[PDB]
Specification:
part of a larger assembly; 11 chains; A mainly alpha (175); B mainly alpha (84); C mainly alpha (124); D mainly alpha (70); E mainly alpha (128); F mainly alpha (459); G mainly alpha (104); H mainly alpha (88); I mainly alpha (274); J mainly alpha (63); K mainly alpha (178); B: 84 residues; elongated; D: 70 residues; mainly alpha; 40% helix; binds cardiolipin; binds the ligand CCCCCCCCCCCCCCCCC[C@@H](O)O[C@H](CO[C@H](O)CCCCCCCCCCCCCCC)COP(=O)(O)OCC[N+](C)(C)C; binds 1,2-dioleoyl-sn-glycero-3-phosphoethanolamine; binds the ligand CCCCCCCCCCCC(=O)SCCNC(=O)CCNC(=O)[C@H](O)C(C)(C)COP(=O)(O)O; NDUFB3 (chain B); mitochondrion inner membrane (chain B); respiratory chain (chain B); transmembrane (chain B)
């Protein structure tokens, strides 16, 4: 279906074996599916088609809101309140988008395990690698901030991480 | 629609200890100098359709005869149908 | 089971420990060492997606049995021969495992006998 | 939805022939099924593949030498 | 002779095994007569109040009111700080708090040390 | 925000100039309309807040509490209609005036963009409730109860006032937005320890915290029915809202100052629950259950994680609704028997079956049956506490079990068994009481369909 | 209160109480829905000894069975591709050391 | 259930039927109003065994306090009828 | 842990069952023993076998409770097996269904209980587990046979022991049809379901002859022993019970102690301290 | 007659509503219904592509 | 149940009660009828051996060792009739028992159905109203001073009188109301 992007939600080509029946016996599954089609799919399709025509008679549009970019917290004065307000709003929007990225990756992982079946451990290794990376980055960004999180606290966490990394690199080089 | 049919009790002279384990009980009691005054009260438990018992193995083989007969018939039919 | 009684009431070192079996090199007995062969490839034995524990040397018979069970669906008693073949393959695999256990037991026996003989010769 | 049957008061109760024939029939089919399954499928109880005797195996296929070579 | 039955707190002695009921004296008979008398007086009072066609509402029970008042409102005026009361109160009111504080403080200290050393493996731990 | 405040004020002239026999009708209708109007506050943002003006603002933590506050008044009027029948018109108008004043104070409290204004209204709520408790109370202990309910409260919040002004002399502002944006860490000092204590103790005394809960059984047992409804449902949540608001300036001291209270809560939730097992009074039983639930909310707020806060908000809303329902049911029993003892009237399912159904639903909701919002809150708090320290589950688990016990105990003692033989004045339940029960319970089961509306600003 | 007379005409037949009689302090503890103290056929101490002894014996025997398991005279199950290395976890870039099964 | 609604005549017939199967009592002498101790010369133990027999006959048991003061077949019938709420 | 818990559960509950007098209590302890067997199966890493056993136990245990309810209703709400006598002939349909259900429960070959329980025992015998758990499972099988014997013997074989007014009646189509559907199920569902599902585990193709027949051996031994012990009740000898009988009849004394010692000490504290 | 109306108003209407809801609302979003991938054996052919899977390696067949 | 209790049980009553309990527990132990008959006659013979004993001290020393012997061999799971205080259906119908006075609260639309029943009910109410006023005076004059000594009531002695306190004994709900 075109309602969603196939690249953001990938799927293997879904090859299904042709049905060849060794036994002459008429299986009940085919006949049951034929009666189900005749009694359910046709009337449902007619109703959906009628609704779609009534919708096409009245077509109107809605748009995805675009947000500009604003200076973040790293370039705001100590007590300047307006720049802090704008930077905080921008950081919160980025946080929400980050949550949804993690949601997307998790969805791919959840779907793959079910889709693969009994061979999931070998098959889902690629998906697992992606979720591992995304979860690690998200954990570095936003873990242990607390209930009263803000852009200043995230920046402080990042600064302490960068200081630790620089000290470790200097120690290893000077070892 | 309920069971209002005027059920009438049997005659009490019908119940006798004779031919039941209660007679044996009365013998073992009289060998001591005693008697069972209620022996005729429970005689109805050994009189009617309750006289004949079934053993445990007899109970487990409730439908063995007809089952075996049907099995033999079916085996004969299958043998005669395959050897064709 | 008798092996349980022999190991738990007799000499524990006399008999193999199933957790650490085998304790002897495969080529110790004879240098021929014929290899175990499989029929099912990696990919088709993945596409059949049997189970990790059903993925053993008997897998081709299992795949044939599954093909039967899928084709002759309405009559669930058509493919019985492939069930028998898979059972036979598992039986042969189990007999091989029993042979391995017996070989390990006899090798331990002969090693301990050699140790006792060497001890006696060194003493005398 | 049944029929009228009165109590008996110290006699055997009344029985319909239908329940008797039904009980006999169902026990009969159970026993027929057991016998038929035993005849056609006997390996499920007595086994099918013989259990080999480990002591009967010769030393040649067991990969063992007569305690002198290796 | 058969093995003796030993009564306990949660499995009391049967009436038929009481030695008291076999030591019968006229004083005990008088006591039992008096107990039956007072019980029957209370029963007569209740039944007279109970069969009255005029009566509507609930027959107030002084015993029930006494029970609830004694359990609820009569405790503190009869309270006296004694060694038993003080020790039991201190134990049952202070010991659990300090026990749980020690447990939780110790657990959090070990977890914090592990995190600082880096060996805890918090992979996939996002929601806290 | 004035679109809710002004009608709540016009409720007073409407009540005072109404006819003698039309005060209840007018008050109920217009309270329902104000609730409908306040419902529009639920449309919230993931961004800052609904800053209406310099004085009032709304958030997704304030909005559910405001909606509950506006919705509770019609229920209190319906409940109070019965036991005030033989009362003069002037005194009935004064009763309705007390209720309206309390709602107005609560509404202005939950918006309250500044902290001294919040303190002033948070303290103004004391007077109408004190008058209601000590004036229209049945027993002779009510006076004593009122005293407790007052002085405890003030003893907790008089230091807070001092702390507040001190903050404004160092920070320069008490506006919550500026307080959030310019927050600074608290150094580990004795002065900062005592400032933390002053900031927290006012809301701990009103939660109530275990050991500071003694005023609560007294005030809840001795108050009239509307008093009990508002004390259990809304007034307990003032402490939760205040502690959620004020902990933004207490970090990182809260990391280690929370230990004495957490224990007091975690052990407390056990003790109070155990108390409910041996209780001869219905109102006392419900009050102690309230203490247990609010202790769980305390633990949530002190842990200070997003899941803790979402769970605490959900549990506060759910507990308000359920405790109000239980108090109303017990009052329906009391109006018939006049005794308030659990063991006196028994086997009422035989005489009042639909009321037995109401009892069952209220008990199940208290017992935290999924997917009710009670269990959503409790489960989120349990998960957050488990992440805090894995051993907490033990205590948590015990509390769950104990809760079920006493809940079903209260259901089996009063509804099941054989009826009391000498009580023959148990009339059939009126339409007013059944409507009251339905209006209590239907919003809970409707809210379980849209939980994000009560999950707070961290959703 | 489970051990009162069930055939007396109590005013509260379910609670087995009479109107006006003194009420025990712990009535809500003994209400026939809760702890009862009625005598039992077997003495309390004997019941405790038997229950504790059975449980302890079963625990000890389970530990003994853990020490002395039961199994079959067979070798370990053999799996083809380096003990199913790729299908169990994976790591296809590490070149794990090969294990070859013995044919006997 | 499907239990027939037993009547006073049924209770009396069953009580006398059970009594006649007691060989210690002569069937000719026994009457509905015949006393147990004086008119039939029976013991107290005989009375308790009679009460247990009636209990096993009717499927419900009589408290010892009530049972010990049932001395005629008529009052046993009356007791059973009052216990089971028998109209006619 | 799962294996050990299941083993102790099945042994203890069957042991309590073999000496009960209430028919519903006997069936309840049978259910608990079967659940213990299911958990034993879970412990030895056979989840699909446990699921199959769930599916078959549904059929035959449900129909067993059907039959118990039929007897209880027909004897005017009497549940003790002491007061039910000869019901083999007085109620034939009820008798036949129960005999079938007891045969299925005790793992009679080619019945609904065979295709699960036989495989359970085979898998437990030929796996790396406790010796104690194995022994408990085998003794539980014997005790299962024992209490099935007890039910049949005490409710269907002897002389009648119910009150004189006979009210026995099965002749209602609802009861008959409801019982017969589950009877057909508990006869044929084993073969049908086993042959229709795909292979979900490696079978036990080769087994020692005595190990293949162990389940039948223990079941027959339990049958014979319980029958012989029940046949001594007709003897004109009367002796006081032993300690083991009192232990098994009062449910290992667990409901006494545990429903008096903890609860008391809790409620007491709840009033005295808290 | 009764069974006809029962099957119409208790089976057909719910299945119609559920089928419409699944086919046109639940399916419109990704990963809402994830179906287990069907088994492929040596010797089948795929409808979508048509390639035939090669047979196995002719294991030595005897008994 | 119905009968008013006494202050104490005499030795005769205690011996009879032990006899009844022992017979019941023998019946529980001896499931079959003939075996029970044999052992019940044996117990009866063993029971009346001391029937003609005269002194009180040895008779009370008996019935005591007898009771200890009972408690040793008391069948931990005795047979209980289904409706007895231990049976499986002891209070099964106590949830279907509704008091009569509930009918006073019926809506007149409900009372419109069953008009004959409520006419009879009103006649019963008037009868109770007169009888109670007579009963109070009868019980007042008949009772000894200082309170009753037993909870046993006198019958009606006049012509139109009714037994004192009869309303709540006559109008029991039923044994099986529904
Ligand atoms: C590997 C080789 C393979 C071959 C193996 C051998 C082949 C078979 C050999 C048989 C061996 C024994 C089988 C017979 C069982 C006995 C039955 C019997 O006669 O009972 C009558 C008799 C008393 O009868 P009663 O008092 O007259 O009853 C009054 C009426 O009869 C009231 O009666 P009722 O009408 O009310 O109801 C009757 C009911 C009531 O009767 C009872 O009271 C039942 C109680 C005993 C039966 C329980 C047996 C199961 C044992 C498992 C226990 C596990 C260990 C527990 C640990 C406890 C720790 C303290 O009895 C029954 O219904 C039937 C009973 C069971 C028979 C059917 C099953 C038996 C076969 C299964 C067992 C062996 C085969 C296993 C298969 C696998 C192969 C290995 O019971 C006994 O005396 C018990 C005998 C043995 C018990 C041993 C346990 C004693 C523990 C004391 C302390 C020990 C020290 C511990 C130290 C710990 C320190 C911490
Ligand atoms: C009544 C029912 C409950 C109601 C609420 C009760 C809860 C109130 C609890 C108040 C929180 C804790 C109070 C003080 C916490 C500070 C930590 C201190 O106690 O621990 C040690 C402090 O050592 C000693 O405790 C010093 C204080 C000793 C004197 C206090 C009295 C102790 C018991 C009094 C309890 C009375 C409470 C009720 C009062 C009415 C740490 O050693 P140190 O490294 O050096 O100091 C660190 C702090 N610095 C860095 C800022 C300096
Ligand atoms: C943790 C357990 C803490 C103990 C909680 C006790 C709660 C006290 C309040 C309960 C209310 C009192 C009550 O209900 O009455 C007792 C009531 C009546 O007794 P009956 O036997 O039914 O008698 C009826 C016939 N006359 O019985 C009960 O229901 C109470 C039962 C209490 C059981 C407590 C024991 C639990 C032990 C758990 C240990 C098992 C560990 C888990 C094993 C699995 C390992 C993976
Ligand atoms: C229901 C009962 C509850 C009772 C309330 C208990 C909480 C008590 C909280 C303390 C009370 C005073 C709070 C202080 C006001 C905040 C302002 C502040 O902290 O400023 C500090 C001042 O802090 C203080 O002065 C506090 C001193 C305490 C004096 C009053 C003691 C009252 C009793 C305290 C012990 C009990 C505390 C816990 C009780 C728990 C509840 C029972 C810094 O002052 P500076 O000198 O300007 O800066 C230092 C650098 N030069
Ligand atoms: C399994 C259960 C085991 C039970 C074990 C118990 C064994 C029982 C053995 C008891 C031994 C005795 O008899 S103890 C003997 C107690 N002492 C006497 O009996 C002396 C005078 N007897 C009486 O007064 C009686 O009531 C009597 C006259 C019989 C009736 O009188 P009635 O004219 O008013 O019917």
């Amino acid at each position: 279906p075109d309602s969603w992007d196939k690249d953001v939600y990938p799927e293997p080509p879904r090859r299904t074996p042709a049905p060849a029946p060794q036994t002459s016996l008429p299986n009940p599954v085919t006949y049951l599916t034929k009666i189900f089609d005749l009694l359910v799919d046709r009337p449902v399709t007619l109703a959906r088609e009628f609704i779609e025509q009534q919708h096409a008679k009245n077509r109107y549009y809605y748009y995805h809101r675009e947000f500009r970019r604003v200076p973040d917290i790293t370039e705001c004065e100590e007590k300047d309140i307006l720049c802090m307000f704008e930077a905080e709003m921008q950081w919160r929007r980025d946080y929400k988008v980050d949550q949804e990225i993690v949601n997307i990756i998790q969805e791919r992982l959840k779907a793959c395990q079910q889709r693969e079946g009994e061979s999931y451990r070998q098959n889902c290794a690629k998906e697992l690698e992606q979720f591992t990376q995304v979860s690690k980055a998200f954990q570095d960004r936003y873990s242990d901030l607390g209930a009263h999180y803000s852009a200043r606290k995230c920046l402080a966490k990042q600064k302490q991480r960068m200081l630790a990394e620089r000290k470790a690199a200097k120690e290893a080089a000077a070892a | 629609e309920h069971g209002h049919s005027k059920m009438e009790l049997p005659d009490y002279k019908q119940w006798k200890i004779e031919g039941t384990p209660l007679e044996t009980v009365q013998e073992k009691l009289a060998a001591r100098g005693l008697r069972d005054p209620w022996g005729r009260n429970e005689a109805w438990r050994y009189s009617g359709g309750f006289a004949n018992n079934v053993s445990f193995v007899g109970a487990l083989l409730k439908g063995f005869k007809w089952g075996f007969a049907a099995f033999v018939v079916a085996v004969g039919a299958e043998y005669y149908l395959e050897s064709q | 089971g008798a092996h349980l009684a022999r190991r738990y009431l007799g000499d524990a070192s006399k008999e193999p420990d199933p957790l650490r079996m085998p304790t002897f090199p495969p080529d110790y007995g004879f240098p021929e060492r014929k290899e175990r062969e499989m029929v099912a490839t990696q990919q088709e034995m993945n596409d059949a997606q049997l189970m990790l524990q059903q993925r053993d040397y008997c897998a081709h018979y299992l795949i044939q049995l599954l093909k039967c069970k899928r084709d002759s669906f309405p009559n669930f008693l058509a493919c019985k021969h492939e069930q028998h073949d898979w059972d036979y393959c598992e039986h042969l695999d189990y007999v091989k495992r029993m042979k391995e256990f017996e070989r390990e037991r006899r090798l331990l026996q002969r090693k301990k006998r050699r140790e006792q003989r060497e001890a006696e010769m060194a003493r005398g | 939805g049944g029929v009228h049957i009165e109590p008996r008061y110290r006699q055997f109760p009344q029985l319909t022939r239908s329940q008797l024939i039904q009980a006999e029939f169902f026990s009969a089919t159970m026993w027929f099924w057991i016998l038929w399954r035993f005849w056609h499928d006997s390996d499920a109880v007595l086994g099918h593949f013989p259990y080999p005797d480990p002591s009967q195996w010769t030393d040649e296929e067991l990969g063992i030498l007569p305690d002198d070579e290796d | 002779s058969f093995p003796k039955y030993k009564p306990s707190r949660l499995a009391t002695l049967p009436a038929t095994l009481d030695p008291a009921e076999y030591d019968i004296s006229p004083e005990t008979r008088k006591a039992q007569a008096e107990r039956l008398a007072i019980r029957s007086r209370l029963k007569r009072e209740y039944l007279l109040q109970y069969n009255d066609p005029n009566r509507l509402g609930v027959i107030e029970d002084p015993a029930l009111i006494r029970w609830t008042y004694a359990r609820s409102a009569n405790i503190y005026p009869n309270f006296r700080p004694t060694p038993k009361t003080s020790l039991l109160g201190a134990l049952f009111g202070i010991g659990p708090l300090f026990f749980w504080y020690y447990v939780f403080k110790t657990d959090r200290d070990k977890k914090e040390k592990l995190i600082q050393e880096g060996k805890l493996d918090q992979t996939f731990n996002i929601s806290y | 925000m004035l679109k809710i405040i002004i009608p709540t004020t016009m409720l007073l002239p409407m009540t005072w100039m109404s006819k003698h026999n039309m005060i209840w009708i007018n008050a109920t209708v217009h309270s329902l309309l104000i609730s409908l109007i306040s419902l529009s506050l639920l449309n919230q943002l993931g961004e800052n807040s609904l800053n209406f003006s310099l004085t009032f603002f709304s958030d997704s933590l304030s909005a559910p509490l405001l909606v509950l506050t506006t919705w509770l008044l019609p229920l209190m009027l319906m409940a109070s209609q019965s036991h005030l029948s033989k009362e003069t018109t002037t005194r009935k108008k004064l009763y309705i005036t007390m209720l309206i004043l309390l709602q107005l104070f609560l509404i202005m409290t939950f918006t309250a963009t500044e902290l001294i204004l919040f303190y002033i209204l948070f303290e103004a709520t004391l007077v109408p409730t004190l008058i209601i408790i000590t004036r229209w109370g049945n027993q002779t202990e009510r006076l004593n109860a009122g005293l407790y309910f007052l002085f405890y409260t003030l003893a907790g919040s008089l230091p807070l006032l001092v702390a507040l002004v001190y903050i404004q002399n160092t920070t320069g502002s008490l506006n919550f937005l500026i307080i959030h944006y310019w927050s600074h860490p608290l150094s580990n000092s004795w002065s900062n320890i005592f400032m933390w204590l002053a900031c927290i103790m006012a809301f701990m005394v009103k939660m109530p915290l275990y050991g500071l809960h003694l005023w609560l059984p007294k005030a809840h047992v001795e108050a009239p029915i509307a008093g009990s409804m508002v004390l259990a449902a809304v007034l307990l949540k003032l402490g939760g809202y205040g502690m959620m608001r004020i902990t933004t300036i207490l970090n990182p001291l809260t990391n280690y100052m929370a230990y004495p209270f957490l224990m007091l809560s975690m052990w407390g939730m056990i003790m109070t629950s155990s108390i409910c097992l041996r209780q001869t009074d219905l109102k006392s039983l419900i009050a102690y259950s309230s203490v247990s639930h609010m202790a769980l909310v305390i633990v949530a707020i002190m842990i200070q994680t997003p899941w803790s806060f979402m769970g605490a908000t959900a549990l506060m809303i759910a507990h308000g609704l359920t405790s109000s329902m239980l108090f109303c049911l017990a009052n329906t029993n009391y109006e018939r028997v006049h005794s308030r003892t659990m063991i006196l009237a028994r086997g009422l399912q035989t005489l009042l079956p639909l009321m037995a159904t109401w009892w069952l639903v209220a008990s199940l909701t208290n017992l935290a049956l999924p997917p009710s919002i009670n269990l959503i809150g409790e489960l989120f708090i349990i998960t957050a506490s488990f992440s805090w320290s894995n051993i907490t589950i033990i205590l948590m688990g015990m509390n769950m079990m104990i809760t079920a016990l006493y809940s079903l105990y209260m259901l089996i003692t009063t509804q099941r068994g054989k009826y009391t033989h000498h009580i023959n004045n148990i009339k059939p339940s009126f339409t007013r009481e059944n409507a009251l029960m339905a209006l209590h319970i239907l919003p809970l089961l409707l809210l379980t369909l849209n939980p994000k509306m009560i999950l707070g600003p961290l959703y | 209160q489970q051990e009162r007379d069930p055939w007396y005409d109590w005013d509260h037949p379910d609670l087995r109480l009479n109107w006006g009689e003194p009420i025990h302090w712990d009535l809500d503890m003994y209400i026939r829905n809760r702890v009862d103290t009625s005598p039992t056929p077997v003495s309390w101490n004997t019941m405790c000894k038997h229950l504790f002894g059975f449980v302890a014996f079963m625990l000890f025997m389970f530990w003994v069975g853990e020490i002395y398991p039961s199994y079959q005279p067979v070798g370990p199950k053999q799996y083809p591709y380096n003990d199913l290395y790729l299908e169990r976890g994976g790591d296809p870039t590490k070149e794990p050391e090969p294990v070859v099964h013995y044919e006997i | 259930s499907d239990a027939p609604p037993l009547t006073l005549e049924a209770i009396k017939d069953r009580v006398l039927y059970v009594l006649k199967l007691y060989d210690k009592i002569d069937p000719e002498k026994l009457s509905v109003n015949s006393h147990f101790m004086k008119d039939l010369g029976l013991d107290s133990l005989d009375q308790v065994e009679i009460i247990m027999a009636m209990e096993d006959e009717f499927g419900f048991e009589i408290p010892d306090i009530d049972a010990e003061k049932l001395m005629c077949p008529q009052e046993i019938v009356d007791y059973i009828a009052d216990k089971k709420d028998v109209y006619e | 842990m799962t294996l050990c818990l299941g083993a102790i559960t099945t042994l203890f509950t069957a042991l309590c069952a073999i000496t009960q007098n209430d028919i519903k209590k006997i069936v309840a302890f049978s259910t608990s023993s079967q659940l213990g067997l299911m958990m034993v199966t879970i412990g030895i890493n056979q989840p699909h076998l446990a699921f199959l056993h769930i599916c078959m136990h549904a059929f035959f245990k449900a129909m067993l409770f059907m039959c118990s309810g039929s007897i209880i209703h027909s004897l005017n709400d009497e549940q003790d097996i002491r007061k039910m006598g000869g019901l083999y002939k007085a109620m034939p349909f009820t008798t036949t269904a129960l005999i079938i259900g007891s045969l299925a429960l005790t793992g009679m070959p080619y019945l609904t209980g065979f295709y699960s329980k036989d495989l359970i025992i085979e898998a437990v015998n030929m796996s790396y587990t406790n010796a104690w758990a194995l022994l408990m499972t085998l003794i539980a099988t014997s005790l299962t046979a024992a209490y099935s014997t007890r039910i049949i013997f005490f409710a269907f074989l002897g002389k009648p022991r119910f009150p004189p007014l006979v009210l026995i009646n099965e002749n209602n189509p609802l009861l008959i049809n409801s019982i017969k559907r589950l009877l057909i199920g508990s006869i044929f569902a084993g073969f049908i379901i086993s042959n229709n599902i795909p292979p979900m585990t490696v079978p036990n193709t080769t087994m020692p002859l005595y190990m293949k027949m162990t389940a039948l051996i223990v079941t027959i031994m339990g049958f014979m022993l319980a029958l012989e012990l029940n046949n001594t009740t007709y003897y004109l000898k009367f002796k006081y019970p032993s300690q083991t009988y009192k232990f098994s009849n009062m449910l290992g004394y667990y409901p006494s102690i545990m429903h008096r010692l903890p609860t008391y000490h809790n409620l007491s504290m709840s009033q005295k301290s808290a | 007659y009764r069974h006809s109306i029962f099957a119409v108003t208790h089976v057909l209407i719910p299945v119609w509503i559920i089928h419409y809801y699944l086919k046109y609302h639940v399916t419109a979003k990704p990963y809402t219904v994830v179906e287990r991938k069907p088994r492929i054996f040596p010797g089948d052919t795929i409808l979508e592509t048509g390639e035939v899977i090669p047979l196995m390696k002719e294991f030595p067949d005897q008994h | 149940a119905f009968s008013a209790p006494a202050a104490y049980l005499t030795h005769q009553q205690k011996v009879l009660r032990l006899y009844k309990r022992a017979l019941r527990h023998l019946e529980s132990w001896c499931v079959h009828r003939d075996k029970y008959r044999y052992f019940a006659c044996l117990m009866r013979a063993r029971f009346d051996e001391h029937k003609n004993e005269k002194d009180m001290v040895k008779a009370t020393q008996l019935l005591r060792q007898a009771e200890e012997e009972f408690w040793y061999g008391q069948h931990p799971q005795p047979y209980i009739f289904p409706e007895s205080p231990g049976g499986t259906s002891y209070e099964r119908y106590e949830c279907y028992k509704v008091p009569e006075w509930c009918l006073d609260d019926w809506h007149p639309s409900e009372k419109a159905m069953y008009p004959d029943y409520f006419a009879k009910r009103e006649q019963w109410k008037r009868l109770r109203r007169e009888s109670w006023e007579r009963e109070v005076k009868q019980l007042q004059e008949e009772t000894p001073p200082g309170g009753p000594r037993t909870e046993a009531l006198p019958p009606a002695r006049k012509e139109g009188d009714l037994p004192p306190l009869w309303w709540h004994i006559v109008t029991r709900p039923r044994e099986r109301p529904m």
